Amino acid sequence: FIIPKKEIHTVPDMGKWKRSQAYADYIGFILTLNEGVKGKKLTFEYRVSEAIEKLLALLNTLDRWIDETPPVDQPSRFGNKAYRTWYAKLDEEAENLVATVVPTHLAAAVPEVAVYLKESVGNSTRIDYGTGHEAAFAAFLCCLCKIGVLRVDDQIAIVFKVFNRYLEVMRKLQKTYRMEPAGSQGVWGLDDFQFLPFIWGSSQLIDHPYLEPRHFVDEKAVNENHKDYMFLECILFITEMKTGPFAEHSNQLWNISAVPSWSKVNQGLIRMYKAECLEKFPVIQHFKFGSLLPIHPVTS
């Protein structure tokens, strides 16, 4: 194990990244989880292991720290400085948190794995959050699979239990500390903060008996179904946070609602994720590379 470090500094480094072992493992992981959740509600009776339970407890610790760290009165009208107090706790305690999940015989892996956790919750200096932080959380989970802490039978729970809870905690950070989107915003982005739940969420909805894409801009449909469906939960967050016509506050998603099937939405969002997140220097340039997700060319 080694200290994961940044490797994307120049334009040619984008190709280095796309040819890397890290990229192959990362995109393979996203696609594997995408397939596993296909056609299933969040309440699907999936297996729940000790490691999954410990990851939920880890996220609940993060949540508790938010409650202990209220917003401060401040002059700035953007991010709330209390975020930095919260983040400092995570920075100090990340290895301890990860150690509650990783059994002692794999203790050597804790510092490397914990770097991804420390990169998954936003930026302290800027008080911002974007799809690069979300990617680091997926990378954190990917590392836990690679070292065998999480297994194939945990894959549905990774999305429906752990990632689902992570999104709740991220929404709470974003609202509580008035966090700024880190990257492209408004007309320029799919969503101000997230990406993966629209991929995995659209996979859930493949072959649904009633819901089709145009239904996600129907407030009634979202209200009656969001508890079962990660995609719909994301839309609910948007409509709760933003006012006015959907077409104006979320134009990209508005256009996506016209797609005739969830399978086509899912296929299109995978393409879009590569183009607008993984191949986007300003979004992905802070990705860190160590031993588990290495910058060396993919083995083959």
Residues making up the binding site for Mg(2+): 186, 192
**What is the Cα 253 distance to its own chain's centre?**
18
Tokens 């991220």 belong to residue: 170
Cross-strand partners of 288: 6
* Half-sphere exposure (Cβ direction) of 248: Cα atoms closer than 13 Å: 4
Length of the chain, please?
Answer: 300
What lies within 8 Å, CB to CB, of 181 at 6+ separation is 128, 129, 130, 189, 192, 193
SS3 296: coil
Contact 55, 166 (CB under 8 A): no
Task: Output the known binding site.
Answer: 126, 131-132, 186, 192, 282, 285-286
The span from the CA of 196 to the CA of 194, in Å, is 6
| Main-chain phi, psi angles of 259, to 5 degrees | -60, 135
- CA-closest candidate to residue 56, choices 197, 196, 163: 163
Task: Output the known binding site for ATP.
Answer: 126, 131-132, 282, 285-286
What lies within 8 Å, CB to CB, of 290 at 6+ separation is 1, 2, 3, 4, 5, 112, 115
Contact 147, 99 (CB under 8 A): no
The span from the CA of 143 to the CA of 119, in Å, is 14
What lies within 8 Å, CB to CB, of 94 at 6+ separation is 114, 115, 117, 118
Helix (H) or strand (E) holding 144: helix 131-146
